Design a protein around this ligand. Structure first.
Ligand code: MG
Ligand code: MG
Ligand code: MG
Ligand code: MG
Ligand code: MG
Ligand code: MG
Ligand code: MG
Ligand code: MG
Ligand code: MG
Ligand code: MG
Ligand code: MG
Ligand code: MG
Ligand code: MG
Ligand code: MG
Ligand code: MG
Lengths: 127, 172, 48, 197, 61, 106
RNA sequence: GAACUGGCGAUGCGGGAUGAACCGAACGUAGAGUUAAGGUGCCGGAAUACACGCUCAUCAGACACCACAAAAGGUGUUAGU
RNA sequence: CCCUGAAAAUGGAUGGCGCUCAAGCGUGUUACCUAUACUCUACCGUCAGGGUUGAUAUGAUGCCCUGACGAGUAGGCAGGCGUGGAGGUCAGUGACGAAGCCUAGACCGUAAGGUCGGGUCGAACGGCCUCUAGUGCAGAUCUUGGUGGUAGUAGCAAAUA
RNA sequence: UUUGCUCCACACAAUAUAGAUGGAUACGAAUAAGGCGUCCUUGUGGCGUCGCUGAACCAUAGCAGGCUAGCAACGGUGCACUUGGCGGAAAGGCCUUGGGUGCUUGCUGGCGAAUUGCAAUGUCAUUUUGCGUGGGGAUAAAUCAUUUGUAUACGACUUAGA
């Protein structure tokens, strides 16, 4: 597997959705801080949505780690994949979205031969 | 509070060069603890003599226990208290087995019948009545008759359970 | 402010609602008190 | 303990019984209340009739059929007291309310079931002797309940049938106790007495 | 709650490093940081602090 | 025999709550035959099962269990506080739970 | 319309049903324990606790800010001079 | 304490139900309930005080040790996210499918956002270090354009047919 | 109107559970009074006894309860078959009679259990529904359209029509 690590605690799995993005179509879900003078969200009235705070920060030991325990590194070619040769216990390769299928076959073959875990090996597989 | 103790508190003015060995004034104070006893002592010395806690001293505080706690006595109690529109002196009689218990009953009774708090009451004097025919209140005299005996009609028994299967009775 | 001239109400509040009757035959809602000493008899009749 | 609890409402105080029953239903106990017409309210009859007339005069001004409803039957006066003691506008409170049945008299099948009392709501245990009290069937009749007499007739004939049942049961109980008397001073009886039975 | 007698999270108000990006100045700073840490001479501390100073705070001599 | 019970009957009353805020993480359990905190102290640490039925067979059964334990006494009348691995659903306010005799100290 | 101080504005949280200012207490994210003010018949978490009295109102009473009551009067009832 | 004094307009408010040796009033002793408050612990950030070079196994704005602290409009400052274009670089991605668009499918970040899979599509487009600005919208009876409910509703009833 | 509908029984499948897990175990009145037993001259009677909680009473032992042999009494319980009687407040239940058929832990034996591996509800209930099997049972209406005007804005109502 990956390097041993403590249990990963998230401290907030629920997405921080913008106030009234469920009310109006024009208000997107991307988080925005309410700045109104009277806003109940800004004033933190009970029963309202929670706002992002630095106290929600992830434990630095487990930060950026996937559930499998690897940090994700985006690769576009074999040479990009080769940089993880000595870091197979801490990093897993992820193949970029715009890599062609025939180049993905080569990347996957090299990754299997070197022992790098690929996050998305089923992308663009012919069958 | 109502778990009253009786303390003797003896104090004096702070000794000076002109008058060493002051006169050692003493009171009997009904209070829940010694801190309150000492405070009540200074309050009363404050009111009677030209002395205060700063210019004075507490030489002794001692709890006074009942001589015969298991001997039913009759107590005459003289109190002075403040009503909503004046100050009044009262005399009351308590049948009880100790002075602290009698004072407890007195405070409960003053609170109940005259809405007088502990704040408003001065205990002037508590004295055992040495013999009958000196008891002046009928609510105490009625318990001094020979071979006194009374029933307790309509006994209500406390249930440990929500439901009962038997339609309880009040015989006793 | 008050009505400024008193007048009795228009119509009777006890004949409400002023809706169509449920049936063309109005129903008898009370019959005469029974008296067991008299012979058996009908309390009402139907006609047109 | 038992799946259904049948409370004889005779001689109970309405509010204290309603509080007990509300807690039972919310805790998940099925309750049937019988003889609601024999429930008691503290205070004199005139005073409680005045209170009910104050309740009667509260109605929605622009439409009386959507206003507060004034149910006259004793079982409904008790039910109304238990509401307001239950959060009836929620699903949990509604679920508690389907756990309750209230009747005047003792209709079947409860007329042959065991009835219980709630001692903490019993008038004879709660009220001070000499305090005046009201009877629910009499208050309901003065308010407009129509069925006091038919309930009384049905209660009288139920009491007759129950009396013959009790006479049969008392005779059988006497002979069972007689047989248990003959079982004494035997070795099995002596051992059971030693063990506590 | 704490009845704070002083402002919270207050920065010291003194430079801990040169504001510049001169690499040779940063090498001098790291040299005198090592000296100021591993020696008890207050000269090294004084020189280290002076290495952080702005232009108006280091007038020509 | 006709009886096979090895647990003590209990009722799930509510969550821990103030007047207007509840805490789903702690449940209040009324154990039958317990009227004082002194008697409730015997049940501290005892395992609790909420047993319910589902239409879908999962692992060879249509019966599912929620497991928890008694943590402390509650109030003056023998009610106890309990915690479950997953909090009780809150439609079970008034439902029956089972308090087993293990872990046992007798 | 001024004075001192504390607040609200700029502030959520527990309590006062409800409420800018009152009471308690001021706030990173969680766990456990203990409390404040306020409460513990039921709604509602928590004693239909314990104890001494008082009150029956054919318009009882039921917690500060606060959502009012007076002069006067009663062989109602209680204590007292 | 209770009662009289004590009269207002929709039906209503010790919060409600109700409560009468109280679930009322005065008082007293305990137990119990629960705040984002207090205590202890973990984690995030900030601030402060420190350690670390006979090469610290070549990152010293790094790694690490210790303590305390964390409300916030107007406002100040800091570190970051995102967009069009420019220099450099990855001899980066791509018709074996770039960009775009849809996706109660997955992953990373407190967040701005980033990444991946699937569908559609057809010609260009990214990462990083820097440079630059016509660089981020929910409001302005905002501009232009498009579209609803109203609603199959009002209306299509003057001038003889 | 598809071999449709309905009731009974067993077989399967689905569906859900406001929440079985020994038994809801029946006088009526009073509470400054009652219950029960007994006797008499039958009462608002005499005598005795009881309560001070259901902490009771009843049920309760057996591979979740197997197989088998006896002893003692003719009892206790289950299942159908039954003879009746009572119950209308929502009766839908209660009291019975007589055989049969199992079980009996009232008392003595004999055989079995294991490995679910040191716990995991460890599944033992009961609403509802459909598809089947085999045994009884019965053989319509309403609406639209037309029509009336005791009705009527339209719906609706009220009439008529093999
Ligand atoms: Mg997340
Ligand atoms: Mg506003
Ligand atoms: Mg504001
Ligand atoms: Mg009427
Ligand atoms: Mg302003
Ligand atoms: Mg208020
Ligand atoms: Mg508030
Ligand atoms: Mg203060
Ligand atoms: Mg209350
Ligand atoms: Mg409660
Ligand atoms: Mg969408
Ligand atoms: Mg594409
Ligand atoms: Mg083209
Ligand atoms: Mg612009
Ligand atoms: Mg816009």
């Amino acid at each position: 597997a990956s390097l041993p690590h403590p249990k990963i605690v998230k401290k907030h799995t629920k997405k921080f959705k913008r106030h009234h993005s469920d009310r109006y179509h024009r208000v997107a879900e991307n988080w925005r801080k309410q700045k109104g003078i009277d806003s109940v969200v800004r004033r933190r009235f009970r029963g309202n949505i929670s706002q992002p705070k630095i106290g929600y920060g992830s434990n630095k030991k487990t930060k950026f780690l996937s559930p499998s325990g690897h940090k994700t590194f985006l690769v576009a070619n074999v040479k990009d994949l080769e940089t993880l040769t000595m870091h197979t216990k801490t990093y897993a390769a992820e193949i970029a979205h715009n890599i062609s299928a025939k180049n993905r076959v080569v990347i996957l073959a090299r990754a299997k031969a070197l022992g790098i875990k690929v996050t998305n090996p089923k992308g663009r597989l012919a069958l | 509070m109502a778990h009253f103790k009786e303390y003797q508190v003896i104090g004096r003015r702070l000794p000076t060069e002109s008058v060493p060995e002051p006169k050692l004034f003493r009171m009997r104070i009904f209070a829940s603890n010694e801190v309150i006893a000492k405070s009540r002592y200074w309050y009363f010395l404050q009111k009677l003599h030209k002395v205060k806690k700063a210019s004075g001293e507490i030489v002794s505080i001692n709890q006074i226990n009942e001589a015969h706690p298991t001997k039913v006595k009759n107590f005459g109690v003289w109190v002075r208290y403040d009503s909503r529109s004046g100050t009044h002196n009262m005399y009351k009689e308590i049948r009880d087995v100790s002075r602290v218990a009698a004072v407890e009953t007195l405070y409960q009774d003053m609170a109940a019948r005259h809405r007088a708090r502990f704040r408003s009451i001065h205990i002037l004097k508590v004295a055992e009545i040495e013999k009958t025919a000196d008891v002046k209140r009928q609510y105490v005299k009625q318990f001094l008759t020979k071979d006194l005996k009374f029933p307790l009609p309509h006994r209500v028994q406390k249930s440990t359970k929500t439901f009962s299967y038997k339609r309880p009775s009040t015989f006793y | 402010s008050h009505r400024k001239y008193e007048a009795p109400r228009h119509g009777h509040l006890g004949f409400l609602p002023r809706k169509r009757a449920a049936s063309i035959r109005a129903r008898v809602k009370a019959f005469p008190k029974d008296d067991r000493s008299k012979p058996v008899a009908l309390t009402s009749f139907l006609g047109y | 303990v038992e799946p259904v609890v049948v409370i004889d409402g005779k001689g109970h105080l309405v509010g204290r019984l309603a509080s007990v029953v509300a807690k039972q239903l919310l805790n998940g106990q099925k309750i049937v209340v019988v003889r609601a017409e024999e429930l008691n309210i503290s205070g004199e009859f005139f005073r409680n009739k005045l209170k009910y007339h104050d309740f009667l005069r509260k109605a929605t001004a622009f439409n009386k059929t959507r206003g507060p409803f004034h149910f006259r039957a004793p079982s409904r006066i008790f039910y109304k007291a238990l509401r307001g003691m239950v959060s009836h506008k929620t699903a949990r409170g509604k679920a508690a309310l389907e756990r309750l049945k209230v009747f005047e008299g003792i209709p079947p099948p409860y007329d042959k079931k065991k009835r219980v009392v709630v001692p903490q709501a019993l008038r004879v245990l709660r009220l001070k002797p000499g305090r005046k009290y009201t009877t629910l069937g009499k208050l309901s009749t003065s308010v407009g309940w129509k069925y006091e007499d038919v309930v009384a007739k049905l209660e009288a004939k139920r009491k007759v049938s129950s009396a013959e049942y009790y006479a049969k049961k008392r005779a059988f109980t006497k002979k069972v106790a007689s047989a248990n008397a003959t079982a004494a001073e035997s070795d099995v009886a002596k051992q059971l007495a030693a063990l506590g039975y | 709650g704490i009845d704070h007698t002083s402002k919270q999270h207050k920065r010291s108000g003194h430079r801990t490093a040169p504001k510049s990006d001169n690499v040779y100045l940063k090498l001098l700073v790291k040299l005198y940081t090592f000296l100021a840490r591993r020696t008890d001479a207050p000269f090294n501390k004084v020189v280290l602090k002076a290495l952080f100073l702005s232009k108006i705070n280091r007038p020509p001599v | 025999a006709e009886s096979h019970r090895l647990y003590v009957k209990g009722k799930h009353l509510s969550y821990q709550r103030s007047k207007r805020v509840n805490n789903p993480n702690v449940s209040l359990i009324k154990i039958e035959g317990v009227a004082t905190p002194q008697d409730a102290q015997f049940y501290l640490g005892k395992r609790i099962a909420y047993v319910y039925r589902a239409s879908k067979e999962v692992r060879g059964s249509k019966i599912r269990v929620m497991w928890g334990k008694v943590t402390r006494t509650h109030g003056n009348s023998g009610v106890v506080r309990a915690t479950f691995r997953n909090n009780l659903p809150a439609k079970t306010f008034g439902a029956s739970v089972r308090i087993f005799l293990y872990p046992s100290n007798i």
